[PDB]
Design a protein around this ligand. Sequence first.
Ligand SMILES: *[B]([O])([O])[C]([C]C1=[C][C]=[C]C(C([O])=O)=[C]1)[N]C(=O)[C]C1=[C][C]=[C]S1
Length: 353
Amino acid sequence: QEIKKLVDQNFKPLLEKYDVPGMAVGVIQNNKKYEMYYGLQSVQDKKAVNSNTIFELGSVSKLFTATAGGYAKNKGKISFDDTPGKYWKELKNTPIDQVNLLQLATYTSGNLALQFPDEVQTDQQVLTFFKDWKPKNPIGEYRQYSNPSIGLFGKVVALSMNKPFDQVLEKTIFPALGLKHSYVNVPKTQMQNYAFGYNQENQPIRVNPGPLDAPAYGVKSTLPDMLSFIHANLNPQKYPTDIQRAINETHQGRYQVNTMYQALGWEEFSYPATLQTLLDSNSEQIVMKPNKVTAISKEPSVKMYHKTGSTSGFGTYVVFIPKENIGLVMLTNKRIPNEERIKAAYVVLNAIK
Ligand SMILES: *[B]([O])([O])[C]([C]C1=[C][C]=[C]C(C([O])=O)=[C]1)[N]C(=O)[C]C1=[C][C]=[C]S1
């Protein structure tokens, strides 16, 4: 194959350009996996990145939250027209027991920001924050990307299965996806495999506990595991029917913001997509500001899906195209610009032609 050469030409230069210590790039094509490893999981230890290296997925964790929601919608445990009060008994008749589970999951409450305020930390300050919530935009009309929005979806999904969110992933979702080294909490036996992240001053760091962190950005995984996740997204037919259902649920577009369709967790596009369309989904306009949605008008015949993710120390990108039977995963232990991630992947996936 030329896959190794294409990844070297497009991903490898980025390590020197952004002083990234380590990178794992995976490609899956026609059911065959390719794994490319570069550099170091730990600078101080001179430990090489390899197939056992655990990275922070950041906002790619939202795809797991969405899958978890899809699984609970299919076991009859929740409905996407329901509201959080039906599960968080404590939150009835507040202006937020008026937002649906789908609207939380898809960022359209109309007044929820990217982050909680710093003072919000304990379970008791989170329970308190949602009661005081009040609308601003007409519900359902405006997309603002948001950790609290999908985090609340996550806790509500977990209440429905009667389990804390971490056990829903580690006991139900991850095993159903055949993932063997994916974690919300990395155990002791695996700590030697958890990479250091590196901040913009090249100091070693890992993610800080934060409010509703697990459902919004708290999953850690390996390249083989993410390639399996992509495999399952490219082929849900082979998987247990419960998880198959869950997966198809995350692929359904719910609304448009120009050329971007919002699905559950995933961002969806018409394929082939221009580079600029993919970059727009990660523009300041799209990620950081409110944008008014529209109903899907053009239902694309052939679709592709992506998502970026970051913690302070780590970068992640995942993209797949069902009807070329291909996909790519990039994991780094230092952030690089979202646009760089999206472009390299673009060149590589087009060249496997
Ligand atoms: B998630 O990765 O989308 C989410 C929000 C975020 C943080 C940094 C950069 C982007 C981006 O450009 O798309 C998005 N991540 C987190 O909340 C964890 C953090 C990462 C950095 C500071 S907190």
